[PDB]
Design an enzyme around this catalytic site. Structure first.
Site, PDB file in Angstrom:
ATOM      1  N   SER A  47       0.797  -1.225   0.000  1.00 44.98           N
ATOM      2  CA  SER A  47       0.000   0.000   0.000  1.00 44.98           C
ATOM      3  C   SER A  47       0.834   1.281   0.000  1.00 44.98           C
ATOM      4  O   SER A  47       0.256   2.357  -0.203  1.00 44.98           O
ATOM      5  CB  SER A  47      -0.966   0.001   1.183  1.00 44.98           C
ATOM      6  OG  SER A  47      -1.931  -1.045   1.046  1.00 44.98           O
ATOM      7  N   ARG A 227       4.986  -0.684  13.300  1.00 42.11           N
ATOM      8  CA  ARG A 227       5.556   0.110  12.220  1.00 42.11           C
ATOM      9  C   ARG A 227       5.749   1.553  12.667  1.00 42.11           C
ATOM     10  O   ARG A 227       6.849   2.111  12.556  1.00 42.11           O
ATOM     11  CB  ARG A 227       4.647   0.042  10.991  1.00 42.11           C
ATOM     12  CG  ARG A 227       4.480  -1.376  10.403  1.00 42.11           C
ATOM     13  CD  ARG A 227       3.387  -1.433   9.357  1.00 42.11           C
ATOM     14  NE  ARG A 227       2.089  -1.090   9.927  1.00 42.11           N
ATOM     15  CZ  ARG A 227       0.961  -1.015   9.234  1.00 42.11           C
ATOM     16  NH1 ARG A 227       0.962  -1.258   7.933  1.00 42.11           N
ATOM     17  NH2 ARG A 227      -0.170  -0.677   9.846  1.00 42.11           N
TER      18      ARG A 227
HETATM   19  C1  LIG Z   1      -3.839  -5.731   3.851  1.00 43.39           C
HETATM   20  O1  LIG Z   1      -4.495  -5.098   4.944  1.00 43.39           O
HETATM   21  C2  LIG Z   1      -4.818  -5.871   6.023  1.00 43.39           C
HETATM   22  C3  LIG Z   1      -4.752  -7.254   6.014  1.00 43.39           C
HETATM   23  C4  LIG Z   1      -5.019  -7.955   7.176  1.00 43.39           C
HETATM   24  C5  LIG Z   1      -5.354  -7.284   8.329  1.00 43.39           C
HETATM   25  C6  LIG Z   1      -5.441  -5.902   8.333  1.00 43.39           C
HETATM   26  C7  LIG Z   1      -5.170  -5.170   7.176  1.00 43.39           C
HETATM   27  C8  LIG Z   1      -5.172  -3.682   7.216  1.00 43.39           C
HETATM   28  C9  LIG Z   1      -6.246  -2.942   6.723  1.00 43.39           C
HETATM   29  C10 LIG Z   1      -6.170  -1.564   6.625  1.00 43.39           C
HETATM   30  C11 LIG Z   1      -5.024  -0.902   7.025  1.00 43.39           C
HETATM   31  C12 LIG Z   1      -3.948  -1.617   7.538  1.00 43.39           C
HETATM   32  C13 LIG Z   1      -2.691  -0.914   7.977  1.00 43.39           C
HETATM   33  O2  LIG Z   1      -1.745  -0.837   7.155  1.00 43.39           O
HETATM   34  O3  LIG Z   1      -2.653  -0.481   9.151  1.00 43.39           O
HETATM   35  C14 LIG Z   1      -4.034  -3.002   7.638  1.00 43.39           C
END
Ligand SMILES: COc1ccccc1-c1cccc(C(=O)O)c1
Ligand SMILES: [Cl-]
Length: 242
Positions: A47, A227
């Site tokens: 992302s 992070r």
């Molecule tokens: C691939 O995103 C995910 C996959 C599994 C569990 C949680 C997430 C998630 C969803 C949205 C934001 C974030 C983050 O970067 O903090 C993480």
């Protein structure tokens, strides 16, 4: 010039983790990292790719502005915040993959490839599916390469309009108080080993800017908050933030 400070490793090991933080002092043009090798190892951007993707979508008119609403497609996904309408600001905030997948489809392979080359972004390789290559395709970028790209964005030096760059930097706004401003984007890569989390961006101070890029092993989603936590501990140790 570059300096290796292995004392930061304590911040990862005390959390039973492994990773790299890379810092860049813009005024002094000096870099700092706990692991020179890992700082230059290339990972899926996941992302964090929403930064270049947003820039390209805006500059091509795929996204009109930061208010345009991208309606939920009505498909229930396992991330609740994704099952709703979004604009560029909230889509960045909640890492709304399906919104950015549609951006990429409308951008198309040809224009995406040209633009990443113009950005000098990572290995510039979009091989894979146009709507997922940053999650499980061939594109790769290192922490040091993230900094180089972010420095261009900060200075409006990327080969898109100034407006596009200002909008994306607005959408990157993560934290602000009387001491600092953080503009950044998180990433979470799970489809290709090793699973990692990213955090890349910069810290604006009154009289300097510190660019940062970190990644860390992320065997489960339980450690995602590390992070930001580990990065800030490094920032505090280096007295960049109180
Ligand atoms: C691939 O995103 C995910 C996959 C599994 C569990 C949680 C997430 C998630 C969803 C949205 C934001 C974030 C983050 O970067 O903090 C993480
Ligand atoms: Cl802003």
């Amino acid at each position: 010039e570059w300096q290796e400070n292995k004392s930061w490793n304590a911040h990862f090991t005390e959390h039973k983790s492994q990773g790299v933080v890379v810092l860049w002092n813009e005024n002094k043009q000096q870099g700092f990292t706990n692991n020179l090798k890992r700082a230059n190892q290339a990972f899926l951007p996941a992302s964090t790719f929403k930064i270049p993707n947003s820039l390209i979508a805006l500059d091509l008119g795929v996204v009109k502005d930061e208010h345009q609403v991208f309606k939920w497609d009505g498909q229930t996904r396992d991330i609740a915040t994704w099952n709703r309408d979004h604009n560029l600001i909230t889509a960045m905030k909640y890492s709304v993959v399906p919104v950015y997948q549609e951006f990429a489809r409308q951008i198309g392979e040809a224009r995406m490839s040209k633009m990443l080359h113009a950005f000098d972004y990572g290995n510039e390789d979009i091989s894979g599916n146009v709507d997922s290559f940053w999650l499980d395709g061939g594109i790769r970028i290192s922490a040091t390469e993230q900094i180089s790209f972010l420095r261009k964005l900060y200075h409006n030096k990327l080969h898109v309009s100034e407006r596009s760059q200002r909008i994306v930097k607005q959408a990157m706004l993560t934290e602000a108080n009387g001491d600092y401003i953080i503009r950044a984007k998180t990433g979470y890569s799970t489809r290709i080993e090793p699973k990692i989390g990213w955090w890349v961006g910069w810290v604006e101070l009154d009289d300097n800017v510190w660019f940062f890029a970190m990644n860390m092993d992320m065997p489960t989603s339980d450690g995602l908050g590390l992070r930001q936590a580990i990065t800030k501990e490094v920032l505090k140790q280096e007295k960049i933030i109180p």
